[PDB]
Amino acid sequence: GSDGEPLVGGDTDDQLQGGSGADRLDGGAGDDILDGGAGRDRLSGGAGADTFVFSAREDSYRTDTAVFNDLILDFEASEDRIDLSALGFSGLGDGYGGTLLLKTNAEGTRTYLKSFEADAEGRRFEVALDGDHTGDLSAANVVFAATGTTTELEVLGDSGTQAGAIV
């Protein structure tokens, strides 16, 4: 059941990876970069502004007889970030022919999305995020993914790269 090589240790900045199998990597406290790897694994950066690196070199999809879905733990959108430049397009739709689809569990605590999936017998890419604080991501919570500048001034009272107001 709970077996393999869990790596609990990252108190000084570096890069930590699970690789593959059953490897629960947990840094602990930092501004470190972590990667859950292939297989069916779980990751938690720790209490910090961690960088959840994902590059789907090892990750692909889950199937009916083999789930290799990544499971992100104790996510804090106020600090945690994610390297999703090559994973997850910018044009939503349904996760089909170059589209993306997101969904939330009953309480919204868990955000489940699919970056380019197929048929239920072919292969379906699906990830599992287990939130604790804010279960929402934005332009800061994710890598810039070679985006443009933000020399914008389209706010009333405050400033920021996201138009909005409170009335």
Q: Which two tokens stand for residue 166?
A: 């409170």
Distance CA 13, CA 33 (A): 8
Distance CA 39, CA 113 (A): 18
- Residue 71: closest CA among 25, 36, 29, 100: 36
Distance CA 54, CA 34 (A): 9
Which parts of the chain are beta strand (E)? 7-10, 15-17, 25-28, 33-35, 42-46, 51-53, 71-75, 81-83, 100-104, 110-115, 128-131
Distance CA 49, CA 66 (A): 32
Residue with tokens 């570096």: 14
Q: Which residues contact 17 (CB under 8 A, 6 or more apart)?
A: 25, 34, 35, 37
> How large is the C-alpha radius of gyration of the chain?
17
Q: Which two tokens stand for residue 48?
A: 């910090």
Instruction: Decide: 115 and 100 in contact? Cβ < 8 Å.
Output: yes
Query: Which neighbouring-strand residues pair with 44?
Result: 26
Distance CA 125, CA 58 (A): 13
Task: Read off the DSSP letter of residue 68.
Answer: -
- Domain ranges for the chain, please list them: 6-143
Helix, strand, coil percentages, rounded to 5, for the chain: 0, 30, 70
Task: Read off the DSSP letter of residue 40.
Answer: S
Distances (CA, A) of 90 to 52, 86, 95, 100: 19, 11, 11, 8
- Residue 110: closest CA among 98, 128, 137: 128
Distance CA 107, CA 122 (A): 30
Reduced to 3 states (helix: H, G, I; strand: E, B; else coil), residue 140 is coil
Q: Which two tokens stand for residue 96?
A: 């089909």
Quick count: other Cβ atoms within 10 Å of Cβ 97?
7
- Residue 27: closest CA among 7, 53, 57, 52: 7
